[PDB]
């Protein structure tokens, strides 16, 4: 009951309840390197929800790529987690999901969006703490951002997610 409590407070500090989430990844160069080196290929973000008692979700990013994007792109996925109120929610999950890599000059962001594949186990009511993540393996070319550009500034980047609430 020492570090465990901190982890809980940090995740609480990062929670949102309106389907909009902004994830700030610091120490970028290092994490990027640990991915490239295969020691830590992916990282989960803290959890957020569609409403106060809505769906519990988080994101997972591979700084050096997953699947078709391995070694060439930054891969970004959506994760449906086991929420405290899943018994009261409608399943499978079927809300539009938008993902973004924010340009820090706010000129041109990187973006993609999709409607859930309702047949996929990724969107069924969770039995485990988290379902299999799904989203965009070719989200962003490692070259574009990372290198020059204004996506990485003061060794950090901002990832943004927007879960459409139509019907909720």
């Amino acid at each position: 009951a020492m570090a465990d409590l901190e982890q809980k407070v940090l995740e609480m500090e990062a929670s949102t309840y309106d389907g909009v989430f902004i994830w700030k990844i610091s120490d970028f160069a290092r994490k990027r390197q640990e991915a490239v080196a295969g020691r830590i290929p992916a990282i989960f973000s803290p959890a957020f929800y569609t409403s106060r008692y809505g769906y519990k979700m988080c994101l997972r990013i591979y700084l050096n790529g997953d699947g078709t994007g391995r070694g060439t792109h930054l891969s970004l996925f959506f994760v449906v987690m086991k929420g405290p109120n899943d018994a009261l929610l409608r399943w499978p999950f079927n809300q539009k999901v938008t993902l973004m890599l924010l340009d820090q000059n706010n000129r041109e962001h990187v973006i993609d969006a999709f409607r859930p594949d309702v047949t996929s186990s990724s969107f069924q009511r969770p039995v485990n703490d988290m379902n299999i993540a799904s989203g965009c393996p070719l989200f962003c070319p490692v070259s574009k951002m990372e290198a020059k550009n204004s996506y990485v500034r003061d060794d950090a980047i901002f990832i943004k997610a927007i879960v459409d609430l139509t019907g909720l």
Binding site: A42, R60, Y62, D66, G67, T68, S75, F77, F78, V97, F114, P116, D117, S120, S122, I132, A133, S134, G135, C136, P137
Partner: peptide, 5 residues
């Protein structure tokens, strides 16, 4: 969407 690997 495409599932993670």
């Amino acid at each position: 969407p495409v599932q993670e690997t």
